[PDB]
């Protein structure tokens, strides 16, 4: 195969959870996707831009191998 | 006569209005005695710069007040303004009232604005007092009680605001501009009178012609998603109305049902739902419905609420991927709330999402007892294959909880299926490089010949890894 | 004599005194919640004092000896400090608690009157990890370890010390009616709270800022290690102790994310004088302000008060009525009331579905005190 592959490494990615908190910063790229969010805030509390952000990154395609190392969940 | 009392103390200062960079104002110059007369007249020797001076004013060790500015070539700068705006936000009534005549008796100025643009209207606004609110009506012209301040708030908007209900009336005799908007919210006096929860103020609005419920804002909401803040008195004021768009749908698709359900109370909600005209079945942009929301926020009171007695149909899944709320439930560690669904009549337990995901598998790679001890109860069946035919053995195998397999071996699953690579779960078990979760396979004398469509053999699997 | 047992019994009814007076729900979490958390660190650390003790003698190397001094300097401040705090009374416990360079504000940075601290010493020896037995014996890295878990329990005691008198100092000002001192200590008890979590369990532990998983993993390498272990049966069990116990002290660390509620309510939208009644009548003078603000009413945890709204001048009229909008939350919410810079006064509660509140109970209440007939 090939010796420069980093498919453990990408594994672990998918596990620290300091590189869970890397994950929370591509969830939290989508306030500049969506600026819904500060509205809802006012309404229906901080939850609500939070539970949109969720639905926003689960709505597509599941991949088996994101899940299995845990970087799927938060 | 307003902040005038006997006995007070007077100090004034002076600073350039520069629209660029920071000013700095003057030291305060020294004390002067209030007596009898209130009113001053202060002489302004002329600017050599030729610049506007704006003058603060303070009593006593109090908060300093900006009372006026001054052109380069004017004098005889008299301090009756910031009087009048002080009487017109006067709690009081007859004193307000009788200190605004007394003002306008000697020549004040009604145009003169304060508090970021803010004219005598608005500060009578915001007080209530309808008796000097008339008397400027009587005399006036549209072009002043429609005059909006620095952040857009027309008179209208205080007045709605704040909660006042005869000045709001007053402004509708007369004739204001009603569907006016803000500034970078583009909020409605509607939406200002929905946000706290005012009735009467709400009921004199729509008194009005010419005004709309459905308004949108800058992100689409309605005053409607508005009235959620509003517990019960302010929705039903919604809702006794004519022409009311209750399924309205926000820039994203959200329904004031689905705030309602996100905010996890339920009054709000079967107030909105004694109007029978509510569509539970109302999607999002991603296909997501307030049962959804619920599943996904754990909210197992609201759930059972709306699951039972009511006609919703909880197949309903996200168009992206076609996954539906039960797996959400199964998703994020929520397993009461997945147990009751489970045992609910109108829930499918073996529907399939995009990939041929089953909620079984998603259990198993959760790694959630309990959800599986409901899934051998019920009678589901075991074998469940995907699209790519992983079946729930390998899943147990593959997941981070190994623990979950051995349950798994008294339950009858075949350790020897494949996928479409011919290899055996013991194959599989040493590519994903666990060490601990392959040895309470290798108890079980499992066979050791077996070869997959590319030729590797357990041997080769652990070769990669180093176990 | 007699005198030295009457000395005792004042300081045990002192500390009753002190433990009984002050009557609150929220003293009463706090309270439970310290106690079980400190009681098995408090005694195996009153059980280990006098080993401590016997091990400060035993360290010779004068590399390591300047750590073991700051750590057994500051155990013995805190010790003598707790000891003279125990037994005054209340009113001299209040005095000594609030003064400036007080044992609070040392204790808040950890260091001592005689520039002694602990926490930059417990950094520096995991820094470098003398505590590894390189030797077959390493006697003085089993002392440097044991030294190291000693400041540890203090730091957690001290943690936990800090924690209580400031919850107590907040409730007792709370009651007696002083609002800006009870919030300030409401802020500082707070922010100690954040500053050691965030000392003992770090900000996700990206940087290991945390010294419990630092000392946990310590432990565990020196457990793993076999050559460099001295075979005692003794040092097996002694460190499962330790990994249970710090184990234990870090679930119940991590248990609670938040102390108190720091939400804060909406004050009124608009105020007015209704009612005509003419103001030569309780503490509403010609010439005064009054100002007011609101609360949740919580009855597990500690609230906060929102800030003082504008003044609002007081001219040929007493009673005001208030507009509150309704509660987001849709909780009660508790009204405070003052005039000038006098005492502020409860005047009343709101509910989430009423909106015009009138401030005309409490006059009556004012005005049946009045010591004139």
Not at chain 2, 144 to 167: F, R
Not at chain 2, 255 to 268: E, G, M
Not at chain 2, 337 to 353: G, T
Not at chain 2, 376 to 402: C, R
Request: glycine content about 6%; hydrophobic content about 40%.
């Amino acid at each position: 195969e090939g010796e420069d592959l980093t498919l453990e490494e990408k594994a672990e990615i998918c596990s620290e959870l300091e590189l869970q908190q890397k994950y929370v910063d591509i969830a939290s790229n989508i306030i500049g996707d969506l600026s819904s969010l500060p509205i809802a805030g006012k309404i229906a509390g901080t939850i609500a831009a939070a539970a949109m952000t969720a639905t926003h990154v689960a709505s597509g395609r599941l991949d088996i191998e994101q899940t299995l190392l845990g970087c799927s969940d938060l | 006569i307003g902040d005038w009392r006997d006995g007070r103390e007077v100090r004034y200062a002076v600073q350039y209005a520069s629209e660029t960079l920071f000013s700095k104002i003057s030291h305060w110059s020294d004390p002067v005695s209030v007596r009898e007369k209130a009113c001053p007249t202060l002489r302004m020797p002329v600017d050599q710069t030729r610049r506007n001076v704006l003058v603060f004013r303070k009593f006593d060790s109090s908060k300093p007040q900006l009372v006026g500015e001054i052109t380069p070539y004017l004098s005889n700068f008299i301090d009756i303004d910031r009087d009048l705006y002080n009487a017109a936000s006067n709690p009081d009534s007859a004193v307000g009232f009788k200190e605004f005549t007394k003002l306008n008796y000697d020549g004040a100025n009604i145009r003169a604005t304060f508090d970021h643009g803010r004219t005598v209207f608005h500060a009578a606004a915001k007080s209530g007092n309808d008796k000097i609110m008339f008397g400027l009506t009587f005399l006036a012209k549209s072009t002043e009680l429609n005059q909006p301040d620095k952040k857009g708030y027309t008179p209208i908007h205080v007045a709605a605001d704040s909660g006042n209900a005869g000045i709001v009336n007053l402004l509708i005799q007369r004739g204001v501009s009603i569907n006016s908007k803000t500034y970078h919210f583009l909020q409605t006096p509607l939406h200002l009178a929905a946000q706290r929860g005012f009735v009467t103020t709400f009921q004199r609005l729509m008194e009005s012609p010419e005004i709309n419920i459905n308004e949108r804002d800058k992100d689409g909401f309605t005053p409607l998603h508005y009235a959620i803040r509003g517990g019960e008195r302010i929705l039903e004021a919604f809702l006794n109305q004519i022409s009311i768009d209750v399924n309205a749908k926000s820039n994203t698709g959200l329904t004031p049902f689905h705030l309602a359900i996100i905010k996890n109370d339920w009054p709000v909600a079967s107030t909105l739902l004694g109007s029978k005209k509510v569509d539970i079945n109302a999607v999002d942009e991603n296909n997501i419905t307030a049962l959804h929301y619920a599943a996904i926020l754990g909210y197992l009171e609201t759930t059972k609420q709306l699951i039972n007695l009511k006609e919703i149909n909880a197949n309903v899944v996200s168009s992206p991927g076609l996954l539906s709320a039960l797996h959400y439930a199964i998703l994020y560690k929520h397993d009461d709330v997945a147990s009751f669904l489970m045992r609910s009549s109108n829930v499918n337990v073996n529907l399939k999402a995009l990939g041929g995901i089953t909620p079984l598998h998603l259990a198993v790679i959760q790694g959630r007892k309990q959800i599986l001890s409901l899934m051998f109860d019920i009678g589901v069946n075991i074998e469940q294959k995907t699209d790519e035919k992983y079946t729930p053995l390998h899943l147990a195998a593959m997941s981070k909880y190994p623990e979950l397999i051995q349950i798994l071996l008294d339950q009858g699953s075949n350790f020897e299926a494949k996928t479409n690579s011919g290899a055996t779960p013991l194959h599989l078990a040493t590519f994903k490089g666990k060490s601990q979760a392959a040895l309470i396979l290798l108890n079980n004398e499992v066979n050791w010949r077996d070869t997959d469509e590319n030729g590797q053999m357990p041997i080769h699997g652990a070769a990669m890894t180093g176990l | 004599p007699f005198d030295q047992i009457k000395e005792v019994l004042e300081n045990r009814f002192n500390e009753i005194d002190r433990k009984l007076d002050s009557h609150s729900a929220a003293l009463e979490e706090i309270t439970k919640l310290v106690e079980k958390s400190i009681s098995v660190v408090e005694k195996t650390r009153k059980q280990m004092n006098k080993r401590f003790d016997e091990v400060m003698k035993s360290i010779q190397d004068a590399k390591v000896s300047p750590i073991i001094s700051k750590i057994n300097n500051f155990a013995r401040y805190f010790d003598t400090e707790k000891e003279r705090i125990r037994g005054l009374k209340l009113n001299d416990y209040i005095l000594k608690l609030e003064e400036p360079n007080g044992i609070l504000l040392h204790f808040k940075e950890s260091r001592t009157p005689t520039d002694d601290s602990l926490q930059a010493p417990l950094f520096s020896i995991i820094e470098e990890g003398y505590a590894v037995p390189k030797s077959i014996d390493d006697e003085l890295a089993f002392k440097v370890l044991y030294a190291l878990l000693y400041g540890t329990q203090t730091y957690v005691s001290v943690m936990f010390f800090l924690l209580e008198q400031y919850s107590f100092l907040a409730n007792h000002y709370y009651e007696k009616g002083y609002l800006e001192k009870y919030d300030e200590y409401f802020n500082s008890l707070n922010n100690v709270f954040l500053d050691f979590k965030s000392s003992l369990v770090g900000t996700g532990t990206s940087n290991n800022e945390g010294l419990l998983d630092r000392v946990l993993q310590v432990l565990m390498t020196v457990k793993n290690s076999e050559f460099l272990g001295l075979e005692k049966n003794g040092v097996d069990e002694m460190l499962n102790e330790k990994i249970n116990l710090f184990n234990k002290i870090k679930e119940e660390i991590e248990g609670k994310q938040k102390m108190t509620l720091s939400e804060t309510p909406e004050n009124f939208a608009q105020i007015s004088f209704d009612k005509d009644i003419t103001t030569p009548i309780g503490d509403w003078r010609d010439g005064r302000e009054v100002r007011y603000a609101v609360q949740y009413a919580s009855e597990t945890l500690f609230s906060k008060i929102s800030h003082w709204s504008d003044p609002v001048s007081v001219r040929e009229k007493a009673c005001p009525t208030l507009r509150m909008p309704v509660d987001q939350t849709r909780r009660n919410v508790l009204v405070f009331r003052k005039f000038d810079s006098s005492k502020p006064q409860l005047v009343g509660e709101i509910t989430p579905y009423l909106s015009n509140f009138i401030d005309i109970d409490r006059d009556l209440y004012n005005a049946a005190s009045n010591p004139d007939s």
